[PDB]
Amino acid sequence: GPVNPAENFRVLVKQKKASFEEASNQLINHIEQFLDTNETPYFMKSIDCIRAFREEAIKFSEEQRFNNFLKALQEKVEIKQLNHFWEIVVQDGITLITKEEASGSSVTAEEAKKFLAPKD
């Protein structure tokens, strides 16, 4: 009976209370750890974590908290070595927090488009 960080998080926030702070901070901590090792099968867990959080956030939480950490993460992995995480997260057809992708169309064209442009 394996355990999933995304599943435990979704439940912890859908039980009665969570505030969306401890479960989030912890989630990001787990992700960081997964990146600590530095393996291929370890990056799969990270993406699965960003996919579970991104949805829970964009849906109705802290969409800006994602594009915030995203802006830093992108520039961080770029000026480090884990630049593959971007080539991966992008290749997966995934994009930043889009206005329409949320409930209220609130996001600049520089956030969703500038982050993922067709031509270089």
Closest CA to 70 of 20, 18, 119, 112: 112
Number of domains present in the structure of the chain: 1
CA–CA dist 81, 20 (Å, integer): 31
> Is 92 in a helix, a strand, or coil?
coil
CATH code (residue 109): 1.25.40.240
Q: How far apart are CA 24 and CA 70, in angstroms?
A: 15
Q: Domain span at residue 82?
A: 1-120
Which tokens go with 103?
């409930």
CA distance 51 to 56: 9
What gap in Å lies between CA 62 and CA 13, rounded to an integer? Answer: 14
Give the separation between CA 107 and CA 112, rounded to whole angstroms. Answer: 7
Task: Identify the experimental approach.
Answer: NMR
